[PDB]
Amino acid sequence: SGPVPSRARVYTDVNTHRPREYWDYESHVVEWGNQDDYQLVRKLGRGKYSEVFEAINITNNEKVVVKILKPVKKKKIKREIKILENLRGGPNIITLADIVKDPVSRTPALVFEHVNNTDFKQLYQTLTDYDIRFYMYEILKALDYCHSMGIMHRDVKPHNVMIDHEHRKLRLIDWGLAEFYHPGQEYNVRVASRYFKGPELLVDYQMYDYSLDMWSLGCMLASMIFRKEPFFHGHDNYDQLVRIAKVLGTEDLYDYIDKYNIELDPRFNDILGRHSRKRWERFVHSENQHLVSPEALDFLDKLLRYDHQSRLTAREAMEHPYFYTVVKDQ
Numbered sequence: 001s002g003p004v005p006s007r008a009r010v011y012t013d014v015n016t017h018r019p020r021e022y023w024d025y026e027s028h029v030v031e032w033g034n035q036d037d038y039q040l041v042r043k044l045g046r047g048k049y050s051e052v053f054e055a056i057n058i059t060n061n062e063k064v065v066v067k068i069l070k071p072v073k074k075k076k077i078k079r080e081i082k083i084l085e086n087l088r089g090g091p092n093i094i095t096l097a098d099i100v101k102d103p104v105s106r107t108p109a110l111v112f113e114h115v116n117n118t119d120f121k122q123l124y125q126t127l128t129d130y131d132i133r134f135y136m137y138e139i140l141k142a143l144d145y146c147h148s149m150g151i152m153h154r155d156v157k158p159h160n161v162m163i164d165h166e167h168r169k170l171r172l173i174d175w176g177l178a179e180f181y182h183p184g185q186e187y188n189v190r191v192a193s194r195y196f197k198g199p200e201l202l203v204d205y206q207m208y209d210y211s212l213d214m215w216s217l218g219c220m221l222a223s224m225i226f227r228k229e230p231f232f233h234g235h236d237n238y239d240q241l242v243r244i245a246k247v248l249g250t251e252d253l254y255d256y257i258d259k260y261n262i263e264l265d266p267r268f269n270d271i272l273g274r275h276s277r278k279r280w281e282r283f284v285h286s287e288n289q290h291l292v293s294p295e296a297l298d299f300l301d302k303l304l305r306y307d308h309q310s311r312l313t314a315r316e317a318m319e320h321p322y323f324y325t326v327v328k329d330q
């Protein structure tokens, strides 16, 4: 036995065709700028792996964002830098402007282009059906691009999506968990926030690909159209799969596990039970109905599949009827 192998349906060999240096980030030599070019203005936030500041480049008086890294292995910093450099200039990808080190503490800091993000509590109540379709399309452009460039984001969620609503501008941020896709590679399943983890992660299927990001995206879409954040609210990684199973149903889950010859943890056998596949109609109510259409539900259904191979690709998703008005306007 052991699990059945898997390959991405698209962009399978994009890294194989690149020079090794493109993806072999362990070999990457970091280009350091001058720390003294930046003065910190104010703290913006703190994350698992960093503290984020607004700063000013005193050479040209530009506003920038500085992410000062907490201690991480040099290869993980190299990976994030290499990915940001490879993706620089791509649609809706955050722009890495510079990389500096404090010469005393030796702490490394990434310097980004400044994006004026719109406060969540003011965005949430104003967003129309059109706005959701528009911003979803913008995220898909970033995902198609990074996938086409041989990179999985692996941490798609609202915290990692900046919107400057005034400028109708979106950026996908926090490439610290992203990885290069190589056919045959077994990845770490301990990635992404619980609520956004794909079934492949939860059942410990390591040979995953770009399609992980499409599950995460579907989770985001569900939370936005149904006004339920998070959508799949698990207590832990095990219960997370139970919450998914109560919606997608257990029949399809067991079909997926059979197809890939996945060995399910003994714990899971007790708690999965038997669940019907639910209709999306049970999440619709008077408050959210203006966001919910046949198109939205058809699209959502085609993202949220157990079987990573059957999810829409980014480029397929962009062709879905949910986006016809957006595509016409652009």
Ligand SMILES: O=S(=O)(c1ccc2ncsc2c1)N1CCC(CCNCc2ccc(-c3ccccc3)c(Cl)c2)CC1
Residues within 6 Å of the ligand: 044, 045, 046, 052, 065, 067, 094, 112, 113, 114, 115, 117, 120, 123, 124, 132, 135, 136, 158, 159, 160, 161, 162, 163, 173, 174, 220, 221, 224
């Ligand atoms: O201040 S920050 O540390 C900072 C500032 C600049 C910067 N530049 C490089 S890293 C960096 C960090 N930062 C923390 C993350 C925040 C995330 C904002 N989420 C907003 C949001 C996104 C997406 C949706 C949405 C979902 C579904 C459909 C359509 C849309 C929704 Cl509703 C809201 C921004 C501020």
Ligand code: NA
Residues within 6 Å of the ligand: 006, 007, 008, 182, 183, 184, 185, 207, 208, 209
């Ligand atoms: Na693979």
